[PDB]
From a paper:
Trp binding in the Sa site induces the organization of the C-terminal fragment of the highly disordered JK-Loop (referred to as the JK-LoopC hereafter) into a β-hairpin structure, while the N-terminal fragment of the loop (referred to as the JK-LoopN hereafter) unexpectedly remains disordered. The substrate Trp binds in the distal heme pocket, which is enclosed by the JK-LoopC and the DE-Loop, and is capped by a small helix from the N-terminal domain. The binding site is lined with a group of hydrophobic residues, including F226, L234, F163, V130, and Y126. The indole group of the Trp, lying perpendicular to the heme, occupies the so-called “A site”. Its indoleamine group H-bonds with S167 via an intervening water molecule. The ammonium and carboxylate groups extend into the so-called “B site”, forming an interlaced H-bonding network with the conserved “GTGG” motif in the JK-LoopC and the G262 in the DE-Loop, as well as the 7-propionate group of the heme. The carboxylate group is further secured by ion-pairing with R231, which plays a critical role in substrate binding and recognition. Together, these interactions force the iron-bound CN to adopt an unusual bent conformation (with the Fe–C–N angle of ~137°) and position its nitrogen atom next to the C2 atom of the Trp in an oxyanion hole, made up by the indoleamine and ammonium groups of the Trp and the peptide amide group of A264. The active site structure is distinct from that of hTDO, but it resembles that of the hIDO1-O2-Trp complex predicted by QM/MM simulations, offering a direct evidence supporting the hypothesized radical addition mechanism. The Trp-binding site is completely shielded from the bulk solvent, except that a tunnel penetrating from bulk solvent into the distal and proximal heme pockets is evident (displayed as the tint lightblue surface in Fig. 1a).
hIDO1 is a heme-containing enzyme that catalyzes the first and rate-limiting step of the kynurenine pathway—the dioxygenation of Trp to N-formyl kynurenine (NFK). It negatively regulates cellular immune response via depleting Trp and promoting the accumulation of kynurenine pathway metabolites. HIDO1 is an α-helical protein, made up by a large C-terminal domain containing the Sa site and a small N-terminal domain sitting on top of it. Here we report the structures of the wild-type hIDO1 in complex with Trp, an inhibitor (epacadostat), and/or an effector (IDE), as well as comparable structures of an active site mutant, F270G.
Residue numbers in the entry: 12 to 362, 374 to 403
Amino acid sequence: SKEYHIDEEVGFALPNPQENLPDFYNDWMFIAKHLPDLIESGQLRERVEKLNMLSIDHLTDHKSQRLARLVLGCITMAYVWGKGHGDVRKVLPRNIAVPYCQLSKKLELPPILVYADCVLANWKKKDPNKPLTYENMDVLFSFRDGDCSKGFFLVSLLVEIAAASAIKVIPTVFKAMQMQERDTLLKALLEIASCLEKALQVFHQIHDHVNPKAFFSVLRIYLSGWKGNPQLSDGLVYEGFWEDPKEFAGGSAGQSSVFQCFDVLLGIQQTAGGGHAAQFLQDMRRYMPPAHRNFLCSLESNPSVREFVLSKGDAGLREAYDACVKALVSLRSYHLQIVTKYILIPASQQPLEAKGTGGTDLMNFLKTVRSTTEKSLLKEG
Ligand code: HEM
Ligand SMILES: N[C@@H](Cc1c[nH]c2ccccc12)C(=O)O
Ligand SMILES: [C-]#N
């Protein structure tokens, strides 16, 4: 669909994003491309403060603006967190803060590195003739040496793309409901379950390409933001553009449109009830590109797939619907095994509730979200 910016091959991911900006923005591009050296050297904060206020008017198209958001995003995280020890800047310089805020307001995103920046736009194809696989792909920007950002962002991207194979089946589902096509609806649901099952298998790759200790103690702090964060409790002031400190949540796959959309499709009311988990998942829609925010909107306006399946007294159709719900439970149960390996165990090894980069009480949050998904199982009900 061209209206919602959903690619046939890669879904919500930005298809074939640009690898370089125009020569007017070469000051920006140099800093972002050598973050591993400049942060380790300890001269990044000096280089950002001593830099001119470049204008956003020269960026012609969407892909250039998204690359600029990624460049400015990675820079802003590197500036604020620094080496990642404790010395954090609570104020972003006017020369970098103003254009980045204006670029963010143009794309209707917040001025912080989001999922759409560091995963959906932060990749390339080595050889265009070869298919989309880990060995044939590479990220555009990293933070540190040995941070496993290549493995992390690409395995994240590959799961997106796998799960996004079920997006093209969604028009078939609602058309089948409108026309009362039982066999088509059942086949479409089983196909969606199959894509979500394959997304879980693609998740297994994370164990090969990402080291837990590297992830937890190096990379994870550069994905953290400044909403519900003791290190920047009042917020982060943007010099020139805003008056008071402004709070924005750090990045997470809570900001992914694909996993939020299957909860909506299947009638799993994650964003209902007024609890803290519902609040986060609804709030993270502000951190998605406006077209994907519009897609989740369009999806919610359709009649309930759940209500349709429950009314028919049809064991095959219930089972097909349940395959999709089971597949989301499996995915989230496995995601919690990843959380145990990559957050909990590393955290216990270093010398009250643990916070995610997105800013949630992660164990309560994730187990609530899974529990809500488990509640939607029919079990031939
Ligand atoms: C090292 C890898 C990963 C870790 C440590 C991790 C950890 C977490 C944490 C702590 C949250 C809670 C939100 C926050 O406050 O930040 C979260 C949310 C989420 N993560 Fe991950 N995550 C990882 C990779 C992935 C991958 C590959 C996916 C792919 C499907 C995924 C899907 C989600 C989703 C969908 C949410 C939102 C809550 C939900 O719908 O279940 N994550 N993750
Ligand atoms: N929220 C995760 C980090 C994470 C996983 N996937 C992401 C995608 C984008 C940004 C951050 C992430 C954590 O607390 O460890
Ligand atoms: C996943 N954050």
